[PDB]
Amino acid sequence: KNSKIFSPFRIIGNVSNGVPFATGTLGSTFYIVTCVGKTFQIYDANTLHLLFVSEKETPSSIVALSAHFHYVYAAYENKVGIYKRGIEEHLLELETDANVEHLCIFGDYLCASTDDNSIFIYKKSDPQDKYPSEFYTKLTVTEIQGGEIVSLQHLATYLNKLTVVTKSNVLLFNVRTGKLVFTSNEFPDQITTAEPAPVLDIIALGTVTGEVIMFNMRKGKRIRTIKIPQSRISSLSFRTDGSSHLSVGTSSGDLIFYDLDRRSRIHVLKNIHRESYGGVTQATFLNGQPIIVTSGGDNSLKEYVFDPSLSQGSGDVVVQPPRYLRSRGGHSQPPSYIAFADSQSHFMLSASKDRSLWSFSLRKDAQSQEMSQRLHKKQDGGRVGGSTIKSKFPEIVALAIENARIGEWENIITAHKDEKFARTWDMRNKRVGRWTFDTTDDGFVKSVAMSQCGNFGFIGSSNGSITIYNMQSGILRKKYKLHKRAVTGISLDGMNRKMVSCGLDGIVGFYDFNKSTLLGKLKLDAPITAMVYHRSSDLFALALDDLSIVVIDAVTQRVVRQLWGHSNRITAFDFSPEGRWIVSASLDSTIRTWDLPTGGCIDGIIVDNVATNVKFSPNGDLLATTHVTGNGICIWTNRAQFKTVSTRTIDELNDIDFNTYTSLEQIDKELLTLSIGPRSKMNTLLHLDVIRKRSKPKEAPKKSEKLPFFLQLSGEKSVREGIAHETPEEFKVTGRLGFESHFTKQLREGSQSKDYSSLLATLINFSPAAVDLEIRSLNSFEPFDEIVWFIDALTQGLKSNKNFELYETFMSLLFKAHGDVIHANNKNQDIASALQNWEDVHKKEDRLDDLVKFCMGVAAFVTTA
Amino acid sequence: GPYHIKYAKNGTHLLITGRKGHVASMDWRKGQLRAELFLNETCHSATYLQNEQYFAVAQKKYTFIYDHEGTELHRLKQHIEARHLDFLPYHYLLVTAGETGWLKYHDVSTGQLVSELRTKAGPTMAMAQNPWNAVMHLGHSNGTVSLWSPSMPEPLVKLLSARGPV
Amino acid sequence: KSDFKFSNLLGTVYRQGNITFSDDGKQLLSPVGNRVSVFDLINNKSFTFEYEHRKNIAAIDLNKQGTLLISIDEDGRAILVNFKARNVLHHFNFKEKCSAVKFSPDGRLFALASGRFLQIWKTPDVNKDRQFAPFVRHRVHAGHFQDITSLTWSQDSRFILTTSKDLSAKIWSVDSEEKNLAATTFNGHRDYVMGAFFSHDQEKIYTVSKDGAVFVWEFTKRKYSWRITKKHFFYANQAKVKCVTFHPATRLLAVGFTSGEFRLYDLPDFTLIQQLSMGQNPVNTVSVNQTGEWLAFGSSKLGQLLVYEWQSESYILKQQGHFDSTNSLAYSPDGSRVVTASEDGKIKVWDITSGFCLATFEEHTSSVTAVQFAKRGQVMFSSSLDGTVRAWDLIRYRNFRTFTGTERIQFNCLAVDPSGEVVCAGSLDNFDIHVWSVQTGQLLDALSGHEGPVSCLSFSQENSVLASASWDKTIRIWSIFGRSQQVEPIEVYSDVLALSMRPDGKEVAVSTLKGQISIFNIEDAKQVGNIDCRKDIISGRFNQDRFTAKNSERSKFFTTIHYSFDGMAIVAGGNNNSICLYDVPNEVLLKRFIVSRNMALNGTLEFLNSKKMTEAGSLDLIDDAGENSDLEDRIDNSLPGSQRGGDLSTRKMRPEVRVTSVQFSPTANAFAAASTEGLLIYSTNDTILFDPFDLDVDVTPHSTVEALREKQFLNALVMAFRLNEEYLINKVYEAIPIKEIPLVASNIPAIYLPRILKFIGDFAIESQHIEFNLIWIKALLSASGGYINEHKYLFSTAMRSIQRFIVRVAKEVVNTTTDNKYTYRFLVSTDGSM
Amino acid sequence: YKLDVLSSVHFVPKPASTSLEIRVETPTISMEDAQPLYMSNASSLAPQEI
RNA sequence: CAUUGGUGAGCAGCGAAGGAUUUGGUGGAUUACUAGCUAAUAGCAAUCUAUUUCAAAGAAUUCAAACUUGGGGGAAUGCCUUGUUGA
């Protein structure tokens, strides 16, 4: 189900899945394109950096991918996609319903074999374009000619032919004439791999019993045979730097190296990959180079290099064994636990069922590193126990990282499967720590926590007892015994003052921490499986057994929300970093988001794999989920970091749904109300002469003399919205009826209609220079109409109790500009009556005066005395 | 940085200068280096004087003169911003030009600044020595080559080689 | 409480890079060091983006929809930001030093000059979700031979005209079909081509170079093949062109030189419209408004930023900041503006909302060490290294008082009386405290008794007892007033720097060189409690030093601390890039803020990249200063053993990161920190962070609007207070009628009183409902103004925010209506006859 | 100046100078910086100075 | 009688087909991942060459250029500037 909060971003931590990768060569560099489920990833073979990730997820799993110079051909369910720089350039739909499962690219031809033993040839249109695009013909390998097609290759200098490797036979097609040129003799065991040798017209075949055949595709014979008993052969590669070595790759994870010239066996790299995940799945020599890139199904991609020989005269007979070079990797099993290492959303800690703790980078995949399990020395000097054959720690149930004292001492505290002590780790060194905290009651560790001072770690055992250790020195400090069944959640305040524990007997205990008292105990109605403490708002959420999420605050110890709606057991949940939402995930294959202000479910995602872990970033950037299948970490980005989402409940006052309140324009008509605008407009209007006199430069600029006089008007054709660039619209006063301004025309029309609302709207609209320039030109000479129309317009204005500081400054600007003519023809009847009714409305403005007098006087008295 | 290369006048010694600071005088055909000094200001050019035994390097501003093993012998207070050094081996003269518009001939044997000449054409973009008659061809930002001698305070010849600079 | 976010960056209006305007050119975007500041010049306000480049930024552009910004730093790490959501969309590393980036006029493409390649990418949407790779490359053209200095798009987003250090300029069509219309190159300049522009009709091309020639290129015949028709020259002899721009619609060429002089021309006729000078430093940036009426200039050496309208010859703003040289700050007694005392010898009074400087004061002839307000924002005292304390009226802007000693010492800290009769100042070379009367000017006393340099002074604000603390490991309490002459010395474990004093004068918190903050009861001189802070300090590693950041003893202590105004917290900073705040009852770290992630400053990284450490020295101590294009930055005039002098050119090391003063805001829940990058202002806001106060399951926004619709107004108000949701409090607050404001305000419970007071303050500063807000203030002060008086320090920042509303908008309005009443009475009551 | 900067500005100040300053009267709007706002609209001379 | 001094001889305890210390080399991180080359709107990458040439454009009396000097004193012969005689 599509979401409206979180949108999928990437699935990190994945390197390969055991599709045989492709190598490609731009110039003299090499790239390695490996499939990770439904995307591929391009790596820079000189340093194994992630160059590209394919832009969209394919609708099914990529099953065969190849790479010529700039282009990558990825075959999934039915069709072949041609990709450049990740972005897909073309899509070739095959005309079948059979799944395409092999392909080769040579010449103008792309040849794609399906699983019904048909081969689809595609041709370029004109030999100058970039990829084969048009349909050409179809080839078929029927049951008479050969078995199931096991490989599809083109060995060089073969003019528009194709070597098709079936399970028993080797056919050779001419793909222009559609013909079957040559069908070899049969092979007494089923051949699994093929690789063309750099020797001319020789292919190398690898069988399901242990032998490599060196078939000569022009003579029709076999040149030689190499026998590796009880080993199924999964890869073949050839060295092409003047050393004739072959490298075979065996599905028990072995990489065997042969000299073909002197027929010896150079070396065997044993357990180069896991047999259980496929063995070595693709191994290839980068050509001209002594480095070979292997990749296996255990989510790992390695490089091995041949050093030059140690004998200075012999060389060819003293071949130094291949050593390890760079490699990338991830988890080989799906991860079991997830945490974010820091507030920047840069690193994230991740523990899997293959008993490894990785630290994956969300910024650059080269920085992903496995936290080392090499133990320290014992503190007294005694021996440490354990097996000599070192294995990894039991798989991680829980962990808690708090990098307040990071680099200083131990930083991560982690709890493993069915063992009675919690290890520590250091994230700075990326290694284990010196301390393993015991539970001291012969119970397994069910929960861990640690304080945000970084001094204290908390262990919660399955016999219901919290033990508090010091993270620096590793010793027991305190031990609380409240619960009698397993303690599944411990957390503590951001001020180390109250801790909160929850057990699966369904009691939440509230303890003071500095004093060792309990503050209270609250019995819920189900066993509690998981706690998450949002630490700034002091609200913690519990996943109860009755499939509800109880949100309870620690200050006043009440259940403050209870979220219902999950149909099966809640696997995980986590708070938003602002603490507004809580995202949960449960075994009904769903992920929900709850707005705990309103208490309802904002969004729901039906996801096909069950999400076992959900974590927000400590900024509001990302959600990280972890599912049942898939070795990586699925990463989502909340779209509500860029837009605002409606907190309106899904199933199966728009300002209050979008958490806003646009403040209304005036609350009551008998209430004074300033303008909706900047507060400084009053001061700019009242003192814009002295402000501009300040703003002048100290001496006059150096102009020219042959400057055009109408420079302000002589523009071209971002349009000017000043009072100077104002045109008249559509028999001699100061402004004729063709040359009336907008202000004077609206003032006259308002004097006709006795309603100056449009005049005052224009006045509140335009700028201070325009306001001064309109008020300063108001026909103060013979009958005084425009002055008195402005005055009773301001009267009609400040009768309405809106914008009234602007109407006050407009009256101040009137008295300043030409109050001398009003003083001159004082006792004129029209202007005296206009000022009279202006004072009649304006004398009710002392409400503001004695209101601010009361507030100032009493506020001063209350604050000081 | 990018390495200005210089060979001794018989091909026995190599003198490289990094742009950053790395000046190395070495016997490139044996494996013997005899000076590797990291002068952490931006060096520009170097040359040998009459031997592998002394070399002059043009540093951030001042031209310095180092002995065979790399100890500093001289800091030249003239030669204010050199970018091009060249030694005149029959005359024992270190010739210096650069971002200043000045060309300076310095006698290495006596120690005496022989000539200061105003190019009067801005910074010196290129510089070469005629091995035949030891006159200096400097290329300016006019597209003008000028042939100079340490006797005449004016160029002996001015040629209009290119457009733009040289 | 503790949930502060980076709000603002006062000081430093410009550092390095290009100024940009908006499309509707109301805001200007200014590259401060690795942030970006945006100053809205009409709505008088300002903000700084939260994100942070790791080096100094060098290029800015945002498209003319205003919807997204892209900022590139000085080694090509681009950052694409959503401009409206203020959140960063993508981090994209171009591999080398990008000189310019420009969006197209139609918004859909952007191009940039990375090295000598012009590369055009196409803009991702703002409506699309974030992808792994949102940028899709259009093309990359390589025809220049040296580095490209400028881009210019055409009016239709169809051609792009680039200028290089190589002495040419080229025109490239965007798409392949118009390749024949745009394939020419423009030679003929003697120096670097600094700009190349089209005319309005895209027929003429103007190419301006560094030496001072502007060429007019036209498609004429001597066939038709882009002749040069006229060369005009600036004839500025010593100076040369540093920045060029052209407004094609008004035909306005604006050119700034390396001498501070800028000239602006009307281009195809080449007539000098104006010529005037920013100063003496070079003009690093010119930018022009979309209507061409405003020109924003930036000089990078003094950090100054003009925007200037050239028609009405007048400066819209002429501001200048201070990089790295800021010794002290002080909030105004209402938190409206911050006074900055800076090492080049001057006082600068910066408005906080609008991020600009109102007044500046230069009467100290040396580095001003301390500023402090007194007489409730009327007077301001400062002490400097030139031997003087002096007092400043902030009404008439006059230095009316100057206090010197008799011994010719330099003063490092001061403290004034509450009842400002006496100023007090202490030095770092004299061991005495100098006590001056302010009414007369004389030296009232010299207090003696420290045996070490008096590092810090503070007067208790209530009982007026002086507390000094000095490097002889001793805090000392002087009863000066009224016949006592009493001295109480409290010893402490190590030498003290930054004492601070509680708002009630009961306790004093000292910071020591061990790394601790000890808190003492003044009257009974015994220690109340200490915080051990030297293990939650981020001390980075410098480039020059040969000892790790773990074992360093450079900055694991706080040189400035400050109490919160409820007395419950301490903010603290030092010569390290962490500022930490604590709550003094529990002595635990509330939050630690990383003050810089700029790698151009020194003490930022704790671990230095081992690739940069070579066989002889690190590669960042190598001075590549002679690889520079001109003499004025090939010059080294840095005299050798100089630390904390002046003139950043004269110190030869990278500027270290340090906070020199921290202060809490007296009115609204924030603090300012005087770092080297500027005045960092960290503030909370209540719009985000759902933090309720004892809500239950029946307390809901739905329940609150049902109680509002059913008009239980007090129940709706307390439900919104228990939600603590700002929109709900505002909705209920505006829905309560005037008839029953005093009943609700009398029945508000006492735990929700500071919430409604601080809400009314932060609402009423900018809200228009002036009589409504004053009715609420009058009702609250009348109904519950005894609880406030007996709980002063709870409402000490909520009441200072309220009388920041009464005297600063309401009293200005009342002044205007009063003057109108009196001018009416004069103009109608008197005799105008002849 | 360069001795102070070399000395890393720990120095000993100049002795004393009772100088003489003439201030004209003007609005303190005009005595400010160039920005849209202002801080005080008084006149730089007191009533007892006028 | 103390060593909270050196060198040893041994117990208890810890303790899974061994334990401790020291060191050389390489690989990965040490900034936030959009691929190599070139004469670059494309080619190459097995190769640029036997199309790499023409045309056009393109030249400031700026025909000015040490913003680059440790201090005092001088400068025969130089060099700079100004005048001058003779061509």
Side-chain angles (χ1 to χ4, degrees), chain C residues 552-619:
Chain C
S552 163
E553 304 281 308
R554 183 184 266 118
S555 52
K556 294 180 188 36
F557 55 95
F558 288 132
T559 49
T560 172
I561 66 169
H562 197 259
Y563 261 117
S564 187
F565 273 85
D566 47 347
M568 310 305 286
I570 280 179
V571 73
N575 285 336
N576 47 22
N577 76 332
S578 82
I579 49 186
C580 314
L581 87 164
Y582 312 87
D583 45 349
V584 315
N586 319 100
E587 306 149 349
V588 72
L589 180 66
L590 292 185
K591 207 185 162 48
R592 167 172 85 198
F593 309 91
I594 299 307
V595 313
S596 187
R597 287 166 90 247
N598 206 344
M599 300 177 165
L601 313 182
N602 222 3
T604 288
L605 261 52
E606 278 186 294
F607 287 86
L608 263 45
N609 197 312
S610 155
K611 269 159 190 154
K612 297 160 180 57
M613 175 69 159
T614 63
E615 292 145 333
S618 157
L619 270 168

Side-chain angles (χ1 to χ4, degrees), chain C residues 52 67 104 197 205 528 622 641 705 771:
Chain C
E52 211 170 341
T67 192
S104 317
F197 316 95
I205 285 183
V528 174
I622 288 185
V705 290
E771 191 180 2

Side-chain angles (χ1 to χ4, degrees), chain C residues 11-13 63 130 178 280-281 313 322 345 349 364 379 442 482 497 506 579 641 673 683 708 735-736 816:
Chain C
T12 63
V13 295
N63 46 354
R130 296 187 46 212
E178 302 162 340
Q280 313 74 14
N281 304 114
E313 309 165 357
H322 297 137
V349 193
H364 281 121
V379 79
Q442 60 185 353
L497 35 97
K506 293 282 159 297
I579 49 186
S683 67
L708 196 61
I736 297 150
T816 296

Side-chain angles (χ1 to χ4, degrees), chain C residues 378-635:
Chain C
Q378 297 308 70
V379 79
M380 174 252 295
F381 289 85
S382 57
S383 74
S384 176
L385 296 181
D386 66 328
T388 53
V389 189
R390 62 188 59 207
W392 305 87
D393 198 25
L394 287 183
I395 313 154
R396 317 300 186 88
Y397 292 160
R398 47 163 67 177
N399 169 41
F400 63 92
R401 260 310 176 278
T402 312
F403 315 96
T404 65
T406 42
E407 317 206 349
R408 283 294 104 193
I409 54 185
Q410 50 196 20
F411 292 128
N412 279 112
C413 61
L414 62 91
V416 307
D417 220 352
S419 71
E421 176 197 296
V422 52
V423 80
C424 210
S427 180
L428 259 54
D429 54 1
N430 202 63
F431 319 119
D432 280 1
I433 310 162
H434 285 66
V435 173
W436 290 282
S437 161
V438 185
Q439 199 59 258
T440 175
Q442 60 185 353
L443 197 147
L444 194 140
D445 199 357
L447 313 170
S448 70
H450 284 299
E451 40 174 353
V454 189
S455 89
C456 41
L457 270 304
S458 179
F459 263 94
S460 155
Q461 291 290 144
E462 291 284 43
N463 56 321
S464 60
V465 73
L466 178 68
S468 55
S470 50
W471 299 357
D472 62 327
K473 320 184 164 46
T474 302
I475 166 180
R476 198 171 279 235
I477 313 295
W478 319 77
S479 300
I480 281 179
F481 297 89
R483 292 157 159 154
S484 87
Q485 314 171 316
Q486 278 292 122
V487 192
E488 173 81 49
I490 314 166
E491 281 213 342
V492 78
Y493 299 83
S494 67
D495 52 313
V496 187
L497 35 97
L499 166 141
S500 181
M501 170 75 52
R502 268 188 90 184
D504 52 357
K506 293 282 159 297
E507 296 173 332
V508 46
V510 291
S511 168
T512 47
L513 192 141
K514 288 295 193 248
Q516 302 186 0
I517 306 177
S518 299
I519 299 146
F520 295 88
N521 189 16
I522 283 174
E523 180 68 28
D524 314 277
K526 47 168 286 303
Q527 177 170 169
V528 174
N530 86 319
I531 319 165
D532 192 45
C533 314
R534 74 165 278 153
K535 276 176 162 322
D536 44 31
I537 270 174
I538 299 303
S539 176
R541 183 177 194 163
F542 279 26
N543 281 259
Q544 58 259 30
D545 63 331
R546 302 190 52 176
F547 48 93
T548 50
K550 175 65 77 72
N551 309 309
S552 163
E553 304 281 308
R554 183 184 266 118
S555 52
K556 294 180 188 36
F557 55 95
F558 288 132
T559 49
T560 172
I561 66 169
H562 197 259
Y563 261 117
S564 187
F565 273 85
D566 47 347
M568 310 305 286
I570 280 179
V571 73
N575 285 336
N576 47 22
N577 76 332
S578 82
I579 49 186
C580 314
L581 87 164
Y582 312 87
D583 45 349
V584 315
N586 319 100
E587 306 149 349
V588 72
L589 180 66
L590 292 185
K591 207 185 162 48
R592 167 172 85 198
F593 309 91
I594 299 307
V595 313
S596 187
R597 287 166 90 247
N598 206 344
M599 300 177 165
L601 313 182
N602 222 3
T604 288
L605 261 52
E606 278 186 294
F607 287 86
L608 263 45
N609 197 312
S610 155
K611 269 159 190 154
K612 297 160 180 57
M613 175 69 159
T614 63
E615 292 145 333
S618 157
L619 270 168
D620 280 284
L621 279 303
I622 288 185
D623 44 345
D624 50 49
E627 322 181 9
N628 276 125
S629 308
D630 50 351
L631 170 64
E632 314 306 328
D633 56 0
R634 280 198 259 97
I635 275 300

Side-chain angles (χ1 to χ4, degrees), chain A residues 357 372-373 375 384 391-396 398-400 410-417 419-426 431-438 445 448 450 459 471:
Chain A
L357 186 57
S372 161
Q373 310 184 11
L375 302 180
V384 193
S391 42
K392 307 209 156 292
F393 306 141
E395 70 99 19
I396 284 184
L399 74 94
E410 272 67 30
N411 181 32
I412 305 144
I413 172 171
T414 206
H416 305 269
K417 178 142 181 43
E419 63 173 27
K420 302 160 172 172
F421 54 92
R423 287 176 220 267
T424 57
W425 300 72
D426 201 339
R431 204 186 135 183
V432 285
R434 312 155 278 165
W435 324 121
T436 72
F437 304 140
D438 196 9
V445 189
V448 291
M450 61 184 293
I459 316 292
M471 303 289 302

Side-chain angles (χ1 to χ4, degrees), chain A residues 722-740:
Chain A
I723 210 67
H725 298 73
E726 163 192 354
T727 62
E729 60 254 16
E730 197 259 347
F731 201 55
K732 170 56 190 36
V733 281
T734 73
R736 290 185 169 86
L737 292 205
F739 270 1
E740 261 174 346

Side-chain angles (χ1 to χ4, degrees), chain C residues 797-808:
Chain C
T797 198
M799 285 295 310
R800 207 94 70 92
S801 176
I802 282 169
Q803 56 206 9
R804 199 216 176 282
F805 150 75
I806 311 161
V807 314
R808 288 283 291 261

Side-chain angles (χ1 to χ4, degrees), chain A residues 662-766:
Chain A
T662 73
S663 159
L664 45 87
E665 293 175 352
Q666 84 154 336
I667 311 195
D668 177 47
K669 305 176 303 185
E670 295 212 286
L671 284 181
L672 264 37
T673 284
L674 304 160
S675 41
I676 300 103
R679 290 305 117 215
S680 56
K681 201 182 176 290
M682 170 173 68
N683 306 140
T684 291
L685 279 181
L686 283 194
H687 309 81
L688 84 161
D689 274 6
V690 68
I691 280 173
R692 295 293 182 156
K693 277 167 51 204
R694 155 181 98 198
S695 86
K696 303 287 291 206
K698 307 300 175 187
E699 56 273 65
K702 293 187 200 166
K703 49 204 187 313
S704 199
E705 43 269 42
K706 308 177 299 183
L707 212 49
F709 194 76
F710 303 114
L711 188 77
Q712 194 184 28
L713 280 307
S714 60
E716 304 217 325
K717 153 175 280 176
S718 183
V719 308
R720 265 147 167 180
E721 302 281 356
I723 210 67
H725 298 73
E726 163 192 354
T727 62
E729 60 254 16
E730 197 259 347
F731 201 55
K732 170 56 190 36
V733 281
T734 73
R736 290 185 169 86
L737 292 205
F739 270 1
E740 261 174 346
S741 176
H742 199 208
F743 182 76
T744 77
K745 181 143 157 48
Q746 273 173 349
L747 185 43
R748 201 174 34 81
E749 288 176 352
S751 162
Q752 315 301 331
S753 87
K754 303 278 204 59
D755 193 82
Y756 302 94
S757 64
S758 283
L759 181 79
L760 297 160
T762 319
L763 273 169
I764 301 309
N765 198 2
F766 51 66

